[PDB]
Design a protein around this ligand. Sequence first.
Ligand SMILES: CSC[C@H]1O[C@@H](n2cnc3c(N)ncnc32)[C@H](O)[C@@H]1O
Ligand SMILES: CSC[C@H]1O[C@@H](n2cnc3c(N)ncnc32)[C@H](O)[C@@H]1O
Ligand SMILES: CSC[C@H]1O[C@@H](n2cnc3c(N)ncnc32)[C@H](O)[C@@H]1O
Ligand SMILES: CSC[C@H]1O[C@@H](n2cnc3c(N)ncnc32)[C@H](O)[C@@H]1O
Lengths: 286, 288, 288, 286
Amino acid sequence: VPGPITLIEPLSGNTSLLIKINAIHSVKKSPYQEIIIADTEDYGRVLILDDYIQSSYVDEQYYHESLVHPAMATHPNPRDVLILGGGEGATLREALKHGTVKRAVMVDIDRDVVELSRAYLPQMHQGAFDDPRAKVVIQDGFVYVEEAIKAGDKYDVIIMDLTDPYSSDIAKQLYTREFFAKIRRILNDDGVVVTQAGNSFYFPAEYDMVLEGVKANFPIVAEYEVWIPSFGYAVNFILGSLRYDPHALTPSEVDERLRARGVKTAFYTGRVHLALMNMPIHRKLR
Amino acid sequence: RKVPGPITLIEPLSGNTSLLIKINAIHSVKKSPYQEIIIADTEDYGRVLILDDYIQSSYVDEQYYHESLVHPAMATHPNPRDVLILGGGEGATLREALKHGTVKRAVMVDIDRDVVELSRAYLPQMHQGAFDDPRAKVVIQDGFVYVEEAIKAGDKYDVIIMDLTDPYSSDIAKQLYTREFFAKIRRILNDDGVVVTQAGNSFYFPAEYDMVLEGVKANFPIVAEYEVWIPSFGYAVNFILGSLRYDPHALTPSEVDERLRARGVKTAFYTGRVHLALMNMPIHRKLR
Amino acid sequence: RKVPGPITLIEPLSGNTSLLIKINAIHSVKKSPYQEIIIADTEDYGRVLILDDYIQSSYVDEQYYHESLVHPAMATHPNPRDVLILGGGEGATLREALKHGTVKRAVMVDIDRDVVELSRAYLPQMHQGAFDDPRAKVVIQDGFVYVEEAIKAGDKYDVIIMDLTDPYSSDIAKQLYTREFFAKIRRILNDDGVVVTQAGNSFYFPAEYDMVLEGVKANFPIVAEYEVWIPSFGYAVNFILGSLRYDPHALTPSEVDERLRARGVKTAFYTGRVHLALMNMPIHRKLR
Amino acid sequence: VPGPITLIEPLSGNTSLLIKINAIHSVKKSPYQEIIIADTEDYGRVLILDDYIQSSYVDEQYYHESLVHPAMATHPNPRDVLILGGGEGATLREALKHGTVKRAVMVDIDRDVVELSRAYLPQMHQGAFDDPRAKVVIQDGFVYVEEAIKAGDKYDVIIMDLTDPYSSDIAKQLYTREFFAKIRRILNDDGVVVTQAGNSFYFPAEYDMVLEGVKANFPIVAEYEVWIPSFGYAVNFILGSLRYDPHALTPSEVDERLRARGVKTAFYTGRVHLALMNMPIHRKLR
Ligand SMILES: CSC[C@H]1O[C@@H](n2cnc3c(N)ncnc32)[C@H](O)[C@@H]1O
Ligand SMILES: CSC[C@H]1O[C@@H](n2cnc3c(N)ncnc32)[C@H](O)[C@@H]1O
Ligand SMILES: CSC[C@H]1O[C@@H](n2cnc3c(N)ncnc32)[C@H](O)[C@@H]1O
Ligand SMILES: CSC[C@H]1O[C@@H](n2cnc3c(N)ncnc32)[C@H](O)[C@@H]1O
């Protein structure tokens, strides 16, 4: 039974997790959110924002590989990547593994998250912030996208790695139908977007809202989920595509693209892709 | 609500993580000779059965568990006529197995009369009358003793489903998870038979998981491992399917759907595509 | 057992501290128009009444609360004949007041019919038949409205006991804790009357405590502050006694005991020596 | 509602406290017990041993003044004081306030507690460890008392400030009938002993055992309790005396002795003494 020091992680409002804490490395009230970096017995080091674990050493690769690789592998040649959120740098780490990437931009609203990750989460970023192909921008992603439309910027793959649509004030504007219309305006004609969408089991209304938003703007939409122990649930992802269909990729094609591009993974493979594409998402059944 | 309440179940998960679950009502508390039983209503999961603090089953998500436990095995077997279930006290496992039109005889063996009785009374959406199907026999006995007696009698089954309390926590079930017990299971299977068991959780309890896996592998030439997230448990349950002849990996979605249709099996979750996903998704392990 | 369970009440205490209390059974859950009511059995405290997550009363320790609330005031008054109780939904306050042989009329006013009804049914050791004493009248009404109507009618009482939900948490009771309300209380007291109220907790909620204290002091020349540890609440409840003539500080143990004897008052806790202790023990404050 | 980081403090087994933690200053697994020093929102800095708060900045004075002053004030001239336990040094701090004290010995089994208190709990010891009248001995108090009998050592006042009789393995031998017989052998003829005895409400059996032990060995016994918010209960104290009766002290006599000896307190006064002597201890009433 966990203790004596414990994190109470909110899950649904009607369920929470109690997680044994071994140490607290940092506590910072930023202008945007409360940040904690801590060591947990079960999950090793974690980043916590407003009481929610964002990432853990023992299971973050399940999250970041699931977020990034299906989209990157679906695109036959992703050269320009935009990441909204991803403050710990693991999303950037995964995207930069694709040898085809020439430019990766990461936009986070909160300098404190990026700085504390640089210092305390080395196994997450793994030097990605200093890759010559990477640019880290501190800005509200809403404003950044407006400015990119004005400039006529274009990306192959846009990855949204934000705080949750069911809980997060600072990210709420990025989950609307209107924002996805803007995302489409900064994609190439064969581009792909992927976002995490919370959890369809515990937060179906918020999930459905994000889904409707993506569907209104993209002809091809894939929904898939992965269990992340440290979150207490299976995260839902939504992949929106303008041309290429993730459902049409075979295990062999996935593995060949990963190999050709020099992508090493702890989890994601062609067989995983097939499973993600075929497993329906969880809903309350009664 | 950061802390669910005011009335809360503290469900152990790993020892280093637990779940706090809002309770709306308690319908029954019974200290049986074997274990502490609670039936309660939860806000998130509806009605639950709890044994020794662990949720065994919930109204909102039990179909994910019982369909995942039962159908891959039953669908792998081309003609399962005789089914044995060890555990399954709430009757949902029996419910799922009886859906296969080919089944002529289903035996369910649970050590604890109180679980079966309280389920009859309080969990109608789980058993759905399965206890009273003319094809079904409910036996109250330790499954270890029952299997020894079946060897003596020379009993044989097509499909054996083990739906017990967890291998990492449950004293009453520990003997049923050994290499030696799986040798006994093999002795009461037909030559083309299949066994399936839940094996706890490979992420939080890898040692206990590996022990069950080694046990199955020592006794069965074909072994499939698959997992499914069950919200009310707080983790993805691991299942281990052991087969003497037929390979679940060889089934196509179309073949699965055709067998389900032919046998009159209606499901809320399991389909040919789900089968494919289960067969191709690797199980979770701590990665660092 | 580091974590009490499996079923647990999470009782808020300060916001920065809460109590986790093992629950054995839930006898009733009722969402009334005013508040959420639970009656439950706890391992440590026996049966409890819970309103909006806060234990109001427990079988094992309620006598410490009700005797401390009622008897100092009743014993201070040389001849209390007419008693008004605001709140006191479980009937234990009424029980204690009626023990004084001098009492001819006791009125108990609670806003919430559901509390009184569920107490009648499930908390017999609290009311102990007090609701049906010929000297007692139970009125269902907001205490604010009742006091306004009593002013209009020119009603007068010897002792007014306020036994409400907390001043730091309770919306329904907030109007009864103001300077202005205590001015109204004074208008329905005889010239030598006394009021007593619980005032939350001066350690965890000093601001709310000080506000109630200032309110009483503005209206009453004699004010005594005392506290008693109530295990089931997680803190020492603060009481404030306001008096128009008679000083509780002037009572000797022997005089208290003589008045209790003369009036036929039997207690489990309160005595003359307890009175002396209550009058001399300073209340708790955060010291750093 | 407390969080996100929380201490789960055991109370009875059937009740525990959840306490918001702001920071952890130190975690040490000593040979004897697990030690944590932390900042709590409600109670400020705390020392925790095996999950139980031993002392908090906001309420420790209620505990230490209640433990020390009734006994010291009962004795007309306490010159030699022995303290068993008291690892944070607050007991020593309170005892040294009496101008009559010439020698105060503090005996704790655990060097780590004393060291971590020196470093992290300055408001508790307040330099008491380095008072010329003080001697700090690291030793099991059972062994120390046996050695004192052999040497024929004598004290005026013995204060036992140990971990709880209902939970603590390392202290169990010091709470027996036989140990109180030994305590009597190292007291002068007019000496006094005082000990905390856990809690008579939640742990009546353990309480009664300590009480029976004291009663078998001392003709005058006083029982009193004080609510300590950070513990979640009213601590019970038991004062054993060979000659002088704490019940016979008037408030004025208490105040005169405090004044004469130069004792300044935040809580204890003559009126408090009278209250402590007259308030019965709590028991489950049903
Ligand atoms: C830790 S990964 C999630 C990241 O998303 C960031 N985030 C939240 N809202 C926004 C926004 N509107 N624009 C950019 N980044 C955001 C948070 O600061 C966090 O670092
Ligand atoms: C609720 S489904 C799990 C069931 O397994 C049952 N069980 C546990 N151990 C054994 C055993 N050795 N034999 C049969 N049933 C068991 C428990 O009684 C429970 O009903
Ligand atoms: C449990 S005893 C405390 C009682 O105070 C009652 N109460 C709260 N606010 C008011 C009010 N304004 N008037 C009368 N009773 C009240 C609650 O219904 C509860 O029964
Ligand atoms: C913090 S005050 C309580 C102290 O009692 C000390 N203690 C516990 N058992 C013994 C013992 N047998 N002898 C001396 N000190 C002890 C502990 O190390 C702790 O520091």
